[PDB]
Structures are given as structure tokens and as C-alpha cells.
Design a protein around this ligand. Sequence first.
Ligand SMILES: Cc1nc(-c2ccc(C(=O)NCCC(F)(F)F)cc2)cs1
Ligand SMILES: Cc1nc(-c2ccc(C(=O)NCCC(F)(F)F)cc2)cs1
Lengths: 185, 185
Amino acid sequence: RELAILATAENLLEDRPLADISVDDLAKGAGISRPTFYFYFPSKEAVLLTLLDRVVNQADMALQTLAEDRENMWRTGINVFFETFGSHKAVTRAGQAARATSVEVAELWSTFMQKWIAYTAAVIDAERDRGAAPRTLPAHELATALNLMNERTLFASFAGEQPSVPEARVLDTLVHIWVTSIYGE
Amino acid sequence: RELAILATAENLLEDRPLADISVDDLAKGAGISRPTFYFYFPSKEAVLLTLLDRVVNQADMALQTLAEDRENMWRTGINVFFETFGSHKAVTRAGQAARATSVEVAELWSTFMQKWIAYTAAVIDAERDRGAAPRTLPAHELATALNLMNERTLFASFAGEQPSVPEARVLDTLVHIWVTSIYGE
Ligand SMILES: Cc1nc(-c2ccc(C(=O)NCCC(F)(F)F)cc2)cs1
Ligand SMILES: Cc1nc(-c2ccc(C(=O)NCCC(F)(F)F)cc2)cs1
């Protein structure tokens, strides 16, 4: 029943914004009543938070799995986000828009971005320690800009935004900019 | 009176979101009544559109002025946006949030981003034609990712977002990533 509500909200988010979806909608698709819905979630907003929270953790776990040539290493890491978020475009789109109106969605996003940037910087620092990358910008600042570039450019591509890099070109585009800015210088 | 309404909306946007500002607020600060306000603008939303439209055109004109070493050339161009938007942070912040709710603000933003990306690509292409930059990524795709990185990273810095590059470091951060990704590979 919790799973059914989640699947239903993801299904419907493919067709319309969260605002055009009602508790009654989610309830119907899940095969339960409205008050029964309120036993699982306080609100439709809470349902989107849980969907985003699962997609973000799935990216984060895949990146932990990788952690356990240099161009390919970065490509494989960026690809976690391309495939994870790009396989859940409706949740990605609605979760990003909700950052504006939900402090819990904003804090969720912020917490994981900090984590991913800290880990990016730790890897740059290792590449510098081994003599493979030059000591140019402070690692954490470089990492932060690269992570934000990916956030905006991935998500603009997935949304078909104008402008955006075509989805079929965006992985290669981001990998080039990461490798050149990390190893260049 | 039109100028007074605009100055007043910019002043108040420094303190609170557009939603916490009423036509009555703008009218008061401008020294006119509410129906007199409606003679100048159809809505508070229209006032923000005009503010954004002036800041965007001021950046765009400064970039046209520049057009009339390689690291410094890119730095001087990125700086147009750092100084123009960074001198109008409240308008930047409210105008970006309005892209979600106003098609006219979305189309304005999109139109100028396309223009700035097209011009970035034309300069990369010239640098490649002269033998100074290598033919790596398609120029327009590289330009699009760099422009989106700047959009998100500048504006996160100006908003004091977590995460963000500190405002005092963001120009140097972006210049490094542009120069390395353009001349590297
Ligand atoms: C090989 C490695 N890759 C990373 C890595 C790769 C990509 C990202 C990344 O795209 N960050 C932005 C995520 C977001 F796009 F916002 F969803 C963050 C970290 C760390 S170590
Ligand atoms: C020397 C040159 N610089 C450019 C240039 C430099 C910077 C930008 C830029 O920051 N684009 C994003 C603007 C935005 F940040 F979104 F406001 C666009 C174009 C073109 S030719």
C-alpha cells in the first residue's frame, strides 16, 4: 500500500505537475481511500519527498559501490547520476521544482550535494597526492562548481529545456569539462 | 513614476519575496495610488519582468561592448555577468524563482541564454579557426554546459546557497573551468 501510493505518484508525475495531482488521485490509483492515504503520508508533498529521497539514495549507494584510465573513472561516476536521475525524470523534475516550496526537499538536496561535492574533492585531492592532477584551484571549490554544473546541465537535458545539451551528448560533454578542469594546467 | 515603482520593487525585493510584496506596497513606496499603479503595469509580476529585462539587457549590452591573453579575455567576459547580476542580487534571485511561474520570465531567460551560448560558441569557433583552441567537443554543446554552469554557480554564490562557491572565489573558479575545457585536449 505504501509502495502502491509511491508507484502511483511516480506514474502520474509523468503526466502532470504535483499541483494537478490530488490526495484523492493518489488514493484512487493505490486502491485505498483518502483517510487510508493519511495513515501512510501526511500530504502529497510528503509522497514526493519520499520519492526523491529514494532516487537520491539510489544514486548515492551506486556511487558508494563504485568507490569500493582517469577519463573512464570520472565518466563512470558522472554516469551514476545520468542513469539514476535520467531513469526517474518525472521525480527529478518535480523534486527540483519542490526545492523552492519545501524546506525538507531543499535540505535533502543540499545534504546530498554537500556529500557528493566532499567526495569529489577527496578524489581530486587523491589524484593530486599521487602526482596525476596539478594543484590548481582549491579542490573543494572546483568540485562544488563541477557538481553544480552537472546538476543544472543534466536536469535541463532531461527536461528538454531550451537551451540544453541533447540528452545523447550530455554525458560526453560533462566528462570532457571534468577531465580537462581536473587535469589541466 | 514608472522609475519610482521599479526602484521601489527592487528596494523591497532586498527584504522579502515577491509573494510578500503587494501592489499596495509598490504603490505606497512610489508615492501613487493603486489604480494609478495599474496605469503603469498590469501586475506586480509585470514589474519584476521589467526589472529582470533591464538587468539582462545591461549584461547583454556590456557583453556587446567587450565584443567591439586568452585567460583574461574569458575572465573579462564572465565578469560581465558576475558584476551585472551580482550588483542586482535581489532581482537576480526573484527573477530566477519567477521562471517557474511566469512563461514571460522563462522565455526572457531562455532567449538571452541562447544568445549568450551562440556567442560563446562563435568565439570558441574563432579560437579553433586561429589554431589556439583544439577541436574537441562540438562548440555549441561545450558552450551550452559552460553557460549553464555559470548560471547555477553564480546565482548559488550570490544567494549564499549551501553548497555554493564563496562569492570572492567564484570568478576565478569559473575562469579556470572555462579556460581548461576550451583550450585543453
Ligand atoms: C569518479 C567520481 N565521480 C564523482 C562524482 C561524479 C558526478 C557527480 C555529480 O554529477 N554531481 C551532481 C549530481 C546531480 F547532478 F546534481 F544530481 C558527483 C560526484 C565523485 S568521484
Ligand atoms: C569572452 C567571452 N565571454 C563570453 C561569455 C562569458 C560568460 C557567459 C555566462 O556567464 N553565461 C551565463 C550567464 C548567467 F550566468 F546565466 F547569467 C556567457 C558568455 C562569450 S565571449
